[PDB]
CSV table of C-alpha atoms in Angstrom, one decimal:
chain,number,residue,atom,x,y,z
O,184,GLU,CA,-29.3,13.9,26.7
O,185,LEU,CA,-26.9,16.7,25.9
O,186,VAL,CA,-27.0,17.9,22.3
O,187,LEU,CA,-24.0,19.2,20.9
O,188,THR,CA,-24.3,21.6,17.8
O,189,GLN,CA,-21.1,22.4,15.8
O,190,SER,CA,-20.7,25.5,13.5
O,191,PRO,CA,-20.1,26.0,10.7
O,192,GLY,CA,-21.1,22.9,8.9
O,193,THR,CA,-18.1,23.4,6.4
O,194,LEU,CA,-15.2,25.7,6.7
O,195,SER,CA,-13.3,26.5,3.6
O,196,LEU,CA,-9.8,28.0,4.3
O,197,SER,CA,-6.4,28.4,2.5
O,198,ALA,CA,-3.2,26.9,4.2
O,199,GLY,CA,-1.8,29.5,6.7
O,200,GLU,CA,-5.3,30.9,8.0
O,201,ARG,CA,-6.7,30.4,11.1
O,202,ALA,CA,-9.7,28.0,11.7
O,203,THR,CA,-12.3,28.6,14.4
O,204,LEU,CA,-14.7,25.7,15.3
O,205,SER,CA,-17.6,26.2,17.6
O,206,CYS,CA,-19.4,23.5,19.5
O,207,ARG,CA,-22.5,24.7,21.6
O,208,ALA,CA,-24.3,22.3,24.3
O,209,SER,CA,-27.9,22.3,25.1
O,210,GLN,CA,-27.2,22.0,28.7
O,211,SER,CA,-24.0,22.9,30.9
O,212,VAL,CA,-21.1,20.4,30.4
O,213,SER,CA,-20.0,19.1,33.6
O,214,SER,CA,-16.4,20.0,34.7
O,215,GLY,CA,-15.5,21.3,31.2
O,216,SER,CA,-15.6,17.6,30.2
O,217,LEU,CA,-15.4,18.4,26.3
O,218,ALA,CA,-13.1,16.8,23.8
O,219,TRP,CA,-12.1,17.3,20.2
O,220,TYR,CA,-11.3,14.8,17.7
O,221,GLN,CA,-9.8,15.0,14.2
O,222,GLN,CA,-10.9,12.5,11.7
O,223,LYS,CA,-8.8,12.4,8.4
O,224,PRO,CA,-10.2,10.9,5.2
O,225,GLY,CA,-10.4,7.1,5.3
O,226,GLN,CA,-9.0,7.3,9.1
O,227,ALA,CA,-10.2,6.6,12.6
O,228,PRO,CA,-10.7,9.4,14.9
O,229,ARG,CA,-7.7,11.0,16.8
O,230,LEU,CA,-8.0,12.8,20.0
O,231,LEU,CA,-6.9,16.5,19.8
O,232,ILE,CA,-8.1,18.2,23.0
O,233,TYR,CA,-9.6,17.0,26.1
O,234,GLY,CA,-10.8,18.8,29.5
O,235,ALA,CA,-11.9,21.6,26.9
O,236,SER,CA,-8.3,23.1,26.9
O,237,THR,CA,-5.7,20.3,27.3
O,238,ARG,CA,-3.8,19.5,24.0
O,239,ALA,CA,-3.3,15.7,23.8
O,240,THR,CA,0.1,14.2,23.7
O,241,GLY,CA,1.7,14.1,20.3
O,242,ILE,CA,-0.6,17.0,19.0
O,243,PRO,CA,0.9,20.0,17.3
O,244,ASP,CA,0.9,23.3,18.9
O,245,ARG,CA,-1.3,24.9,16.3
O,246,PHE,CA,-4.3,23.3,18.0
O,247,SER,CA,-5.7,25.1,20.9
O,248,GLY,CA,-9.2,24.5,22.7
O,249,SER,CA,-11.2,26.8,24.9
O,250,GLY,CA,-14.6,27.2,26.5
O,251,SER,CA,-16.8,26.4,29.4
O,252,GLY,CA,-20.6,25.9,30.1
O,253,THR,CA,-22.3,25.5,27.0
O,254,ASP,CA,-19.8,27.3,24.6
O,255,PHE,CA,-16.4,25.5,23.3
O,256,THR,CA,-14.0,26.4,20.5
O,257,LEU,CA,-11.4,24.6,18.8
O,258,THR,CA,-8.7,26.8,17.1
O,259,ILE,CA,-6.2,25.7,14.5
O,260,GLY,CA,-3.7,28.5,14.5
O,261,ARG,CA,-2.2,28.3,11.1
O,262,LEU,CA,-3.7,25.7,9.0
O,263,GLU,CA,-1.5,23.0,7.2
O,264,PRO,CA,-2.7,20.9,4.2
O,265,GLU,CA,-2.6,17.9,6.5
O,266,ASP,CA,-5.5,19.6,8.6
O,267,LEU,CA,-8.0,18.5,6.1
O,268,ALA,CA,-10.6,16.6,8.0
O,269,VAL,CA,-13.9,16.4,9.8
O,270,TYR,CA,-13.7,17.7,13.4
O,271,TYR,CA,-16.0,16.5,16.3
O,272,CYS,CA,-16.5,17.7,19.8
O,273,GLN,CA,-17.7,15.3,22.4
O,274,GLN,CA,-18.9,15.9,26.0
O,275,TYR,CA,-18.3,13.3,28.7
O,276,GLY,CA,-19.6,15.3,31.8
O,277,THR,CA,-22.8,13.3,31.8
O,278,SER,CA,-23.9,9.7,30.4
O,279,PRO,CA,-24.5,8.9,27.7
O,280,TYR,CA,-21.4,10.6,26.1
O,281,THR,CA,-22.6,12.6,23.0
O,282,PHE,CA,-20.9,14.0,19.9
O,283,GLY,CA,-21.5,17.2,17.7
O,284,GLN,CA,-22.3,16.5,14.1
O,285,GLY,CA,-18.9,17.6,13.0
O,286,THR,CA,-17.3,20.3,11.0
O,287,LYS,CA,-15.8,19.7,7.6
O,288,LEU,CA,-12.6,21.5,6.9
O,289,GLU,CA,-11.8,22.1,3.3
O,290,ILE,CA,-8.6,23.5,1.8
O,291,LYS,CA,-8.5,26.4,-0.8
O,292,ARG,CA,-5.4,26.5,-3.1
O,293,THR,CA,-4.2,27.7,-6.5
O,294,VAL,CA,-5.6,26.2,-9.6
O,295,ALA,CA,-3.8,23.0,-10.9
O,296,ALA,CA,-4.4,21.3,-14.3
O,297,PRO,CA,-5.0,17.7,-14.1
O,298,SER,CA,-2.7,15.1,-15.8
O,299,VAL,CA,-5.0,12.9,-18.0
O,300,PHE,CA,-4.3,9.1,-18.4
O,301,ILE,CA,-6.4,6.4,-20.3
O,302,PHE,CA,-6.6,2.6,-19.8
O,303,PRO,CA,-8.2,0.2,-22.2
O,304,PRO,CA,-10.1,-2.7,-20.7
O,305,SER,CA,-7.9,-5.6,-19.8
O,306,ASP,CA,-8.1,-8.9,-22.0
O,307,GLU,CA,-9.1,-10.8,-18.9
O,308,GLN,CA,-12.0,-8.7,-18.2
O,309,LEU,CA,-13.2,-8.6,-21.8
O,310,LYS,CA,-13.1,-12.3,-21.9
O,311,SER,CA,-16.0,-12.4,-19.4
O,312,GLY,CA,-18.3,-10.1,-21.5
O,313,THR,CA,-17.7,-6.9,-20.0
O,314,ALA,CA,-15.3,-3.9,-21.0
O,315,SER,CA,-14.4,-1.2,-18.4
O,316,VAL,CA,-12.4,1.7,-20.1
O,317,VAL,CA,-10.9,4.1,-17.4
O,318,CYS,CA,-10.0,7.8,-17.6
O,319,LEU,CA,-7.7,9.1,-14.8
O,320,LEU,CA,-7.6,12.8,-14.0
O,321,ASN,CA,-4.8,13.3,-11.6
O,322,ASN,CA,-3.9,16.0,-9.1
O,323,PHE,CA,-6.0,18.9,-10.2
O,324,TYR,CA,-7.6,21.5,-7.8
O,325,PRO,CA,-10.9,23.1,-8.5
O,326,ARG,CA,-12.9,19.9,-7.9
O,327,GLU,CA,-15.0,20.8,-10.9
O,328,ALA,CA,-14.0,18.9,-14.1
O,329,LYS,CA,-15.9,17.6,-17.0
O,330,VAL,CA,-15.2,14.3,-18.5
O,331,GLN,CA,-17.0,13.4,-21.8
O,332,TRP,CA,-16.6,10.0,-23.4
O,333,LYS,CA,-16.7,9.5,-27.0
O,334,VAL,CA,-16.7,6.2,-29.1
O,335,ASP,CA,-16.0,6.5,-32.8
O,336,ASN,CA,-16.8,10.3,-32.3
O,337,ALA,CA,-20.1,9.6,-30.8
O,338,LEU,CA,-20.8,11.2,-27.4
O,339,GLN,CA,-21.7,8.8,-24.7
O,340,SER,CA,-24.2,9.3,-21.9
O,341,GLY,CA,-25.6,7.1,-19.3
O,342,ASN,CA,-22.8,4.4,-19.4
O,343,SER,CA,-20.1,5.9,-17.2
O,344,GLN,CA,-19.6,6.6,-13.5
O,345,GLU,CA,-16.9,8.5,-11.8
O,346,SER,CA,-15.4,8.9,-8.4
O,347,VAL,CA,-13.3,11.5,-6.8
O,348,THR,CA,-11.0,11.3,-4.1
O,349,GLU,CA,-10.9,13.7,-1.0
O,350,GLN,CA,-8.5,16.4,-1.1
O,351,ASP,CA,-4.9,15.1,-0.9
O,352,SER,CA,-3.4,15.6,2.6
O,353,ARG,CA,-0.1,17.1,1.0
O,354,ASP,CA,-1.1,19.3,-1.9
O,355,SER,CA,-4.9,19.7,-1.5
O,356,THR,CA,-5.6,18.3,-5.2
O,357,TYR,CA,-8.2,15.9,-6.1
O,358,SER,CA,-8.0,13.0,-8.5
O,359,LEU,CA,-11.0,11.7,-10.5
O,360,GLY,CA,-11.6,8.3,-12.1
O,361,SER,CA,-14.2,7.9,-14.8
O,362,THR,CA,-15.1,4.4,-16.0
O,363,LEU,CA,-17.1,3.8,-19.2
O,364,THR,CA,-18.7,0.4,-19.1
O,365,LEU,CA,-19.6,-1.4,-22.2
O,366,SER,CA,-20.4,-5.1,-23.3
O,367,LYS,CA,-17.9,-7.2,-24.9
O,368,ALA,CA,-19.9,-6.8,-28.3
O,369,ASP,CA,-20.5,-3.1,-28.2
O,370,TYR,CA,-16.6,-2.6,-27.4
O,371,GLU,CA,-15.5,-4.7,-30.0
O,372,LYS,CA,-17.8,-3.1,-32.8
O,373,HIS,CA,-16.1,0.4,-32.3
O,374,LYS,CA,-12.4,1.6,-32.7
O,375,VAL,CA,-11.7,4.8,-31.2
O,376,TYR,CA,-12.3,5.5,-27.6
O,377,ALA,CA,-11.7,8.9,-26.2
O,378,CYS,CA,-11.9,10.8,-22.9
O,379,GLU,CA,-12.3,14.5,-23.2
O,380,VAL,CA,-11.4,16.5,-20.1
O,381,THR,CA,-12.3,20.1,-19.4
O,382,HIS,CA,-10.8,22.0,-16.4
O,383,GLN,CA,-10.1,25.6,-15.4
O,384,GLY,CA,-6.4,24.8,-15.4
O,385,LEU,CA,-6.7,23.9,-19.1
O,386,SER,CA,-6.5,26.5,-21.8
O,387,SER,CA,-8.7,24.0,-24.0
O,388,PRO,CA,-10.1,20.6,-23.3
O,389,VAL,CA,-7.6,17.8,-23.8
O,390,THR,CA,-8.4,14.4,-25.1
O,391,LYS,CA,-6.8,11.1,-24.3
O,392,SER,CA,-7.5,8.1,-26.8
O,393,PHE,CA,-6.6,4.8,-28.1
O,394,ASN,CA,-7.7,2.7,-31.1
O,395,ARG,CA,-8.7,-0.8,-30.1
O,396,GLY,CA,-6.5,-3.2,-31.7
O,397,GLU,CA,-3.4,-1.2,-31.8
O,398,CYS,CA,-0.4,-1.4,-29.7
A,207,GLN,CA,-2.1,-0.3,16.1
A,208,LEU,CA,-2.0,-1.6,19.7
A,209,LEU,CA,-5.9,-2.0,19.4
A,210,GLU,CA,-6.8,-4.7,17.0
A,211,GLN,CA,-10.3,-5.2,15.9
A,212,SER,CA,-12.3,-8.1,14.3
A,213,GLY,CA,-12.9,-8.0,10.5
A,214,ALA,CA,-15.8,-6.3,8.6
A,215,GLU,CA,-18.8,-8.6,7.8
A,216,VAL,CA,-22.2,-8.7,6.5
A,217,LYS,CA,-25.0,-9.6,9.0
A,218,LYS,CA,-28.5,-10.5,8.0
A,219,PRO,CA,-31.5,-8.5,9.5
A,220,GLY,CA,-32.4,-10.1,13.0
A,221,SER,CA,-29.0,-11.6,13.8
A,222,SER,CA,-26.4,-10.7,16.2
A,223,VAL,CA,-22.8,-9.5,15.8
A,224,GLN,CA,-19.9,-9.7,18.1
A,225,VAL,CA,-17.1,-7.1,17.6
A,226,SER,CA,-13.9,-7.7,19.5
A,227,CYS,CA,-11.1,-5.6,20.5
A,228,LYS,CA,-7.6,-6.8,21.6
A,229,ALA,CA,-5.2,-4.6,23.6
A,230,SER,CA,-1.8,-5.4,22.1
A,231,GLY,CA,0.1,-4.6,25.4
A,232,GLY,CA,-1.1,-7.9,26.8
A,233,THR,CA,-3.1,-6.2,29.4
A,234,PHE,CA,-6.2,-4.1,30.2
A,235,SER,CA,-4.3,-2.1,32.8
A,236,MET,CA,-6.9,0.4,34.2
A,237,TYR,CA,-8.2,1.3,30.6
A,238,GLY,CA,-11.9,1.3,29.8
A,239,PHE,CA,-12.8,0.1,26.4
A,240,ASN,CA,-15.8,1.7,24.5
A,241,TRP,CA,-17.5,1.3,21.3
A,242,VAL,CA,-18.4,4.1,19.1
A,243,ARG,CA,-20.2,3.7,15.7
A,244,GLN,CA,-20.4,5.8,12.6
A,245,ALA,CA,-22.7,5.3,9.6
A,246,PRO,CA,-20.6,5.7,6.4
A,247,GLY,CA,-20.7,9.4,5.6
A,248,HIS,CA,-22.0,10.3,8.9
A,249,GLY,CA,-21.2,11.3,12.6
A,250,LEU,CA,-20.0,9.4,15.7
A,251,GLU,CA,-22.4,8.1,18.5
A,252,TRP,CA,-21.2,6.4,21.7
A,253,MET,CA,-22.7,2.9,22.3
A,254,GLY,CA,-21.2,1.8,25.7
A,255,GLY,CA,-18.3,0.4,27.2
A,256,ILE,CA,-16.5,-1.8,30.0
A,257,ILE,CA,-13.6,-1.1,32.5
A,258,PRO,CA,-12.2,-4.5,33.0
A,259,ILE,CA,-10.3,-3.7,36.1
A,260,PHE,CA,-13.5,-2.6,37.9
A,261,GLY,CA,-15.9,-4.8,36.2
A,262,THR,CA,-17.9,-1.8,35.3
A,263,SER,CA,-20.1,-1.6,32.3
A,264,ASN,CA,-22.9,0.6,30.9
A,265,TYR,CA,-24.3,2.1,27.7
A,266,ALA,CA,-26.6,4.3,26.0
A,267,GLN,CA,-30.3,3.8,26.4
A,268,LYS,CA,-30.8,3.8,22.5
A,269,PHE,CA,-29.4,0.2,22.7
A,270,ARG,CA,-31.0,-0.9,25.8
A,271,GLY,CA,-31.8,-4.7,25.5
A,272,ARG,CA,-29.6,-5.1,22.5
A,273,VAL,CA,-26.0,-4.8,23.9
A,274,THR,CA,-23.7,-6.8,26.0
A,275,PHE,CA,-20.1,-5.9,26.9
A,276,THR,CA,-17.6,-8.5,28.4
A,277,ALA,CA,-13.9,-8.7,28.6
A,278,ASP,CA,-11.3,-11.7,28.7
A,279,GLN,CA,-8.1,-11.0,30.8
A,280,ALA,CA,-6.7,-14.2,29.3
A,281,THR,CA,-6.7,-12.8,25.9
A,282,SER,CA,-6.7,-9.1,26.6
A,283,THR,CA,-9.6,-8.9,24.4
A,284,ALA,CA,-13.1,-6.9,25.1
A,285,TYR,CA,-16.3,-7.6,23.2
A,286,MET,CA,-19.4,-5.9,22.4
A,287,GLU,CA,-22.7,-7.9,21.3
A,288,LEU,CA,-25.3,-6.2,19.4
A,289,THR,CA,-28.4,-8.2,18.7
A,290,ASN,CA,-31.6,-8.0,16.6
A,291,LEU,CA,-29.7,-6.2,13.9
A,292,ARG,CA,-31.5,-4.0,11.3
A,293,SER,CA,-30.3,-2.1,8.3
A,294,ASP,CA,-29.8,1.1,10.3
A,295,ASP,CA,-27.1,-0.5,12.3
A,296,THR,CA,-24.9,-0.7,9.5
A,297,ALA,CA,-21.8,1.2,10.6
A,298,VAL,CA,-18.0,1.2,11.3
A,299,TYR,CA,-17.9,0.1,14.7
A,300,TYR,CA,-14.8,1.7,16.5
A,301,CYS,CA,-13.2,0.3,19.7
A,302,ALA,CA,-12.1,3.5,21.6
A,303,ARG,CA,-9.9,3.3,24.8
A,304,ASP,CA,-10.2,5.6,27.7
A,305,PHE,CA,-8.3,6.0,30.9
A,306,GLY,CA,-8.7,7.5,34.5
A,307,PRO,CA,-5.7,9.0,36.5
A,308,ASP,CA,-7.9,9.5,39.7
A,309,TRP,CA,-4.9,9.3,42.0
A,310,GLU,CA,-5.1,5.6,42.1
A,311,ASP,CA,-8.7,4.9,41.6
A,312,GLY,CA,-11.4,4.7,38.9
A,313,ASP,CA,-12.7,8.3,38.9
A,314,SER,CA,-12.4,10.9,42.0
A,315,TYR,CA,-10.9,14.3,41.4
A,316,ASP,CA,-8.9,16.9,39.5
A,317,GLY,CA,-11.7,18.0,37.3
A,318,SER,CA,-13.0,15.8,34.5
A,319,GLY,CA,-12.7,11.9,34.3
A,320,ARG,CA,-12.7,8.9,31.8
A,321,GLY,CA,-15.0,10.1,29.2
A,322,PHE,CA,-12.6,10.8,26.3
A,323,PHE,CA,-10.8,8.4,23.9
A,324,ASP,CA,-7.1,8.6,23.4
A,325,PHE,CA,-6.8,5.5,21.3
A,326,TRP,CA,-9.0,4.2,18.6
A,327,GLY,CA,-8.9,0.9,16.7
A,328,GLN,CA,-9.0,0.9,12.9
A,329,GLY,CA,-13.0,0.2,13.0
A,330,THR,CA,-15.1,-2.8,12.0
A,331,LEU,CA,-17.5,-2.3,9.2
A,332,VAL,CA,-20.7,-4.3,10.0
A,333,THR,CA,-23.1,-4.2,7.2
A,334,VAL,CA,-26.7,-5.3,8.0
A,335,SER,CA,-28.1,-6.8,4.6
A,336,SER,CA,-30.0,-9.9,3.5
A,337,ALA,CA,-27.8,-10.0,0.4
A,338,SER,CA,-24.8,-12.4,0.4
A,339,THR,CA,-21.0,-11.3,0.4
A,340,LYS,CA,-19.3,-11.4,-3.0
A,341,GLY,CA,-15.6,-11.0,-3.4
A,342,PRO,CA,-13.9,-8.6,-5.9
A,343,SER,CA,-12.6,-9.4,-9.4
A,344,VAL,CA,-9.6,-7.6,-9.6
A,345,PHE,CA,-8.4,-6.3,-13.2
A,346,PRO,CA,-5.0,-4.4,-13.9
A,347,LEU,CA,-4.9,-0.7,-15.2
A,348,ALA,CA,-1.8,-1.6,-17.0
A,349,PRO,CA,0.8,1.3,-17.7
A,350,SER,CA,1.3,2.1,-21.3
A,351,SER,CA,2.2,4.9,-23.7
A,352,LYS,CA,-1.5,6.1,-23.1
A,353,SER,CA,-0.8,6.5,-19.4
A,354,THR,CA,2.7,8.2,-19.2
A,355,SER,CA,3.3,12.0,-18.7
A,356,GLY,CA,7.0,13.2,-18.8
A,357,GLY,CA,9.1,10.5,-17.0
A,358,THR,CA,5.9,9.2,-15.1
A,359,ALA,CA,3.5,6.4,-15.8
A,360,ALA,CA,0.2,5.7,-14.2
A,361,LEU,CA,-1.0,2.3,-13.4
A,362,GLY,CA,-3.5,0.6,-11.0
A,363,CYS,CA,-6.2,-1.9,-10.0
A,364,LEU,CA,-9.7,-1.9,-10.9
A,365,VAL,CA,-11.8,-3.7,-8.2
A,366,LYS,CA,-15.0,-4.9,-9.5
A,367,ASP,CA,-18.2,-6.2,-8.3
A,368,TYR,CA,-17.9,-6.9,-4.5
A,369,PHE,CA,-20.2,-6.7,-1.9
A,370,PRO,CA,-20.4,-5.2,0.9
A,371,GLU,CA,-18.1,-2.5,1.7
A,372,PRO,CA,-15.1,-2.2,2.6
A,373,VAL,CA,-12.2,-3.1,0.3
A,374,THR,CA,-8.8,-1.7,1.5
A,375,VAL,CA,-5.9,-1.6,-1.1
A,376,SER,CA,-2.2,-1.4,-0.4
A,377,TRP,CA,0.8,-1.3,-3.0
A,378,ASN,CA,3.7,-3.7,-2.7
A,379,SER,CA,2.4,-4.7,0.7
A,380,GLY,CA,2.7,-1.1,2.0
A,381,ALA,CA,6.2,-0.4,0.6
A,382,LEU,CA,4.7,1.8,-2.0
A,383,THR,CA,2.6,4.7,-0.7
A,384,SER,CA,3.6,7.9,-2.4
A,385,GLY,CA,1.4,8.8,-5.4
A,386,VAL,CA,-1.2,6.3,-4.6
A,387,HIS,CA,-5.0,7.2,-4.9
A,388,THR,CA,-7.7,4.8,-4.0
A,389,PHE,CA,-11.0,6.1,-5.1
A,390,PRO,CA,-14.2,5.8,-3.0
A,391,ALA,CA,-16.3,2.9,-4.4
A,392,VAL,CA,-19.3,3.5,-6.5
A,393,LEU,CA,-22.6,1.4,-6.1
A,394,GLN,CA,-23.2,0.2,-9.6
A,395,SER,CA,-26.9,-0.6,-10.9
A,396,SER,CA,-26.2,-4.2,-10.3
A,397,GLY,CA,-26.2,-3.3,-6.5
A,398,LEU,CA,-22.5,-4.5,-6.4
A,399,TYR,CA,-19.6,-2.0,-5.5
A,400,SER,CA,-16.6,-0.9,-7.6
A,401,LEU,CA,-13.5,1.1,-7.0
A,402,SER,CA,-10.1,1.4,-8.5
A,403,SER,CA,-6.7,2.3,-7.0
A,404,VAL,CA,-4.0,4.1,-9.0
A,405,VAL,CA,-0.4,5.1,-8.5
A,406,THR,CA,2.1,7.1,-10.5
A,407,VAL,CA,5.6,5.9,-10.7
A,408,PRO,CA,8.9,6.6,-12.7
A,409,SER,CA,8.5,5.2,-16.2
A,410,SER,CA,12.1,4.0,-16.1
A,411,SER,CA,11.1,1.7,-13.1
A,412,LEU,CA,8.4,-0.3,-15.2
A,413,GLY,CA,11.0,-2.9,-16.3
A,414,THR,CA,12.8,-3.5,-13.0
A,415,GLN,CA,10.3,-2.7,-10.1
A,416,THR,CA,7.4,-5.1,-9.6
A,417,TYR,CA,4.0,-3.5,-8.7
A,418,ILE,CA,1.4,-5.3,-6.8
A,419,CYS,CA,-1.9,-4.0,-5.6
A,420,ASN,CA,-3.1,-5.9,-2.4
A,421,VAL,CA,-6.9,-5.9,-2.2
A,422,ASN,CA,-8.5,-7.0,1.0
A,423,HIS,CA,-12.2,-7.7,1.3
A,424,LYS,CA,-12.9,-9.1,4.8
A,425,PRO,CA,-16.6,-9.6,4.4
A,426,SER,CA,-15.7,-12.2,2.0
A,427,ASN,CA,-12.7,-13.6,3.7
A,428,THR,CA,-10.9,-12.9,0.3
A,429,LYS,CA,-7.3,-11.1,-0.2
A,430,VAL,CA,-6.1,-10.7,-3.8
A,431,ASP,CA,-3.0,-9.7,-4.9
A,432,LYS,CA,-2.6,-8.6,-8.5
A,433,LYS,CA,0.6,-8.0,-10.3
A,434,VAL,CA,0.4,-5.0,-12.8
A,435,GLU,CA,2.8,-4.8,-15.7
A,436,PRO,CA,3.0,-3.1,-19.1
A,437,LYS,CA,0.9,-5.2,-21.5
A,438,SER,CA,2.8,-7.0,-24.4
A,439,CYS,CA,2.2,-6.1,-27.9
C-alpha cells in the first residue's frame, strides 16, 4: 500500500504569503494520479487539484499543483483568510486509494482584544438543580487567553470548562466560551459572579460580573 | 447538496450499519460512489465504492469480510453496509462521487482515471458505543445589559447533556449566519456532551427581530427550536 507523507504537519502564515505543502509517496504514483483536497472547519472535503496539476472547476487561481513520481506539491500563491483549513493529498494510481495525514494551515494576524459578555444561568435550568454560568470572549486573536471565575470574590478551580472555536474564515480570530457549573444550592448561596479575562490585547484584565437577584 | 446522506446514529459493538447516499439528480449516470471515513480530529481513509453503470465494486483489504456495496437505480441511492462494528469504527462516513471521462467507457486513456472525488456528501457520523443516545436540553443565553457592547448584543443557546455527537445548530432556520459562533462540544465528567452557539446582533433589533436557534441531534431523532429573548425583570 502506498504511504503518503505530508509536510509540514502545521503551517503558520499570514494572509498574503505563499503556502507550500509537500506530499511524498513511498512508491511511484502511477500516471500522476494525485489529488489535493481542502477541508475547512466543520465541512466536508473539497477537491482542489487532480492529475497532480489540474485545478478543479470553481477553484481559485491561487491554487496550483505540481510534481511527479514520489514528490508532489500544493501551492497557495497568495493566502486568503478563507484558506484556513487542513489540506490532504490522495493517490488513486493504485488500489487501495490512500491519503496523506494532512497539513493544517493556520493564519497569523494582528492582535485583537476580545469583547467579553456574561450570561447568568436560565431559571429553567436552575429549576432542575444545575446552574451553568457562561462567559463569552468574542473575536480575539492570539488564541492564548485566561479566564478566571470568582464567586463572592473567591477564585474558582476545577468547576469550569472552556471551548474555543477554530479561527474565523473571515478575520482569523477566535472566540472562547467558558462555563462555570454549580449545583442550584451552591449558586443560590452566593451573590457576585465574575469572569476575569486576561489577554494580550487588553492593557489590564477586564471583568464581567452580575449579582444574582438583580435585574 | 446533490448528494444526501443518512443521519448520524449510535450503534452497539457487534452490530451493523448501513450508510446511504442519494444522488439528487435522479440518476447515477456514469458516476462512481465511494465511501471515505474520518475519525473526529483525524484523517481520511478510503473504504470502497461502486460504479452502478458498470456494476463494479471493490474496497480496501482493511475491511475485507466487513463491507458490502449496493446501489438502487429506482431511488438513485447507493449504500454501504459495515458489519461487526467496534469502537474504532466511530467516524464520519462521507459519500464521495467520482467520474471517468474515458472517451465513452469506464477507464481507458488520457492519463489518470476515476480515483478522485469531485463531490462529497455532508457526512454521516456513526458512533459505536454501548451507551444509549440522549437528546439535548437547550437553554437560552439571553441577551441582557451584561452581554452588550456598543450597539451590539450577544445571545445564544446552551446545548446540554446529549450523546453521542454530533449536534448541528443554525439560527432562524439559516437566515442568520453572520456573527454566529458555534463552539466545539466538550465531553463533561458525566460522559455527556455540551456545546453552545452564540451570535452577536444589533441591540436595536432585540425588540423587533425574533431569534431562534435550531438544534439538530440526529442520533436521538430530535430537533429542538429555542426562541431566545431578553429576560423580563
